[PDB]
Amino acid sequence: GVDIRHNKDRKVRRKEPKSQDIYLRLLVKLYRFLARRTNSTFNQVVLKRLFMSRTNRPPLSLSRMIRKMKLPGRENKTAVVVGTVTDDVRVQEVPKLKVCALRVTSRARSRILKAGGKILTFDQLALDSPKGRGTVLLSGPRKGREVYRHFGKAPGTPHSHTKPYVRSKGRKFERARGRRASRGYKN
C-alpha cells in the first residue's frame, strides 16, 4: 500500500505516425537509426517532426526563407524544412538557394531552377550531411490558422478580442445589445 497517485504516469506524446504510406516509413526507418546512433540533435529533432500531423507541420512560404536567409552570417548554407514550400508572387527578386523539403510546388520548383538553385531530398541530405552541420532549420507559422482566432477568453467579457461563431456577418447579426452602449451594456 503506497499513496502514489497514478494520474499522469503515461506520457501522451507521439511515438510513431498514423500514416500508412511507405515513402514516409522508409525515411523514418533511416532516422530512427540515425537518432539512436549518432550524438547530434538534428536527427532527434527531425525525427520528432516526421510524426506530427499536417496541421502541425505547416507550409513555409518562400519569403520567410529569403527573410530568414538574408541574415548576415548564413551564407552558403542549406535549409531544412520538414513541412512544405509554396510559391509566392509578391516577390520579384529571388536569389539562388539550397532547399531540403518534402513537397515543392510546381511554380516555385521552376522558380528556383531558373534562378540556378538546388532542391535536395531527405536521402540526399543523408548522403550529404549525416550529423547535422551547416544546415539552417526552419518551420512555418504554427499559430497562423483562422481557428486560433476563435479561442481564448470568451467574448462578452471585458478586455477580450475574440471572433464568435456567426452564420453570416451583417448589420443585424450580433451588433445590438452587448456591444452598443445604449442597449444594456458593453464588453
Partner: protein, 149 residues
C-alpha cells in the same frame, strides 16, 4: 486515514509505505518537523553497527530513477566522483560523522525496505514513555533494528 499536513511531511522525508526508515541529520529546522508526526514514527540515534547492517544488507542505490543494488565500488564512483567518495567506507564515514556532502549521499540512497518486527511491538499508537513504540527512544532503536533489520 491520514492528515493532509502530515502526509506532505511523510512525502518530504520520502516515507511512502509502512515500515520505511531513513537517516536524518538534526537541527532546529528538522526537529520541529519531526515533532508534528510523533504518532506515526519511532525515531532514535543509531549505533555504529546498525549502519553497517543497513548498508551492506538492505542498501540499494538510485541510478537514473531506478533501483540498482550495490555490488561494487564503481556503482558509487559514477554518481559520487565529484565529492571524493569512491567506495562504501567513505560513505559510511560521511553518514556516521556527517560531512559536508551528506545531501548527495542521502538523496542517492533509496528508502530502505525493512521487514516485519520479530516478537512483536508493544502497542503501536501511544508513546514510548507510557509503554508504546512511537516517540523518541534515544538508544533503544538498536533494539528495533536488531529485531527488524
Amino acid at each position: 486515514g491520514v492528515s493532509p499536513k502530515v502526509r506532505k511531511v511523510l512525502q518530504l522525508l520520502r516515507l511512502r509505505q509502512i515500515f520505511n526508515g531513513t537517516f536524518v541529520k538534526l537541527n532546529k529546522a528538522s526537529i520541529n518537523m519531526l515533532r508534528i508526526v510523533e504518532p506515526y514514527i519511532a525515531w532514535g540515534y543509531p549505533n555504529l553497527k546498525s549502519v553497517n547492517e543497513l548498508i551492506y544488507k538492505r542498501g540499494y542505490g538510485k541510478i537514473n530513477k531506478k533501483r540498482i543494488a550495490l555490488t561494487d565500488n564503481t556503482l558509487i564512483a559514477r554518481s559520487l566522483g565529484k565529492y571524493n567518495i569512491i567506495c562504501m567506507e567513505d560513505l559510511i564515514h560521511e553518514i556516521y560523522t556527517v560531512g559536508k556532502h551528506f545531501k548527495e549521499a542521502n538523496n542517492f540512497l533509496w528508502p530502505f525496505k525493512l521487514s516485519s518486527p520479530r516478537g512483536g511491538m508493544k502497542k503501536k499508537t501511544t508513546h514510548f514513555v507510557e509503554g508504546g513504540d512511537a516517540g523518541n527512544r534515544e538508544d533503544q532503536i538498536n533494539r528495533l533494528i536488531r529485531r527488524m533489520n
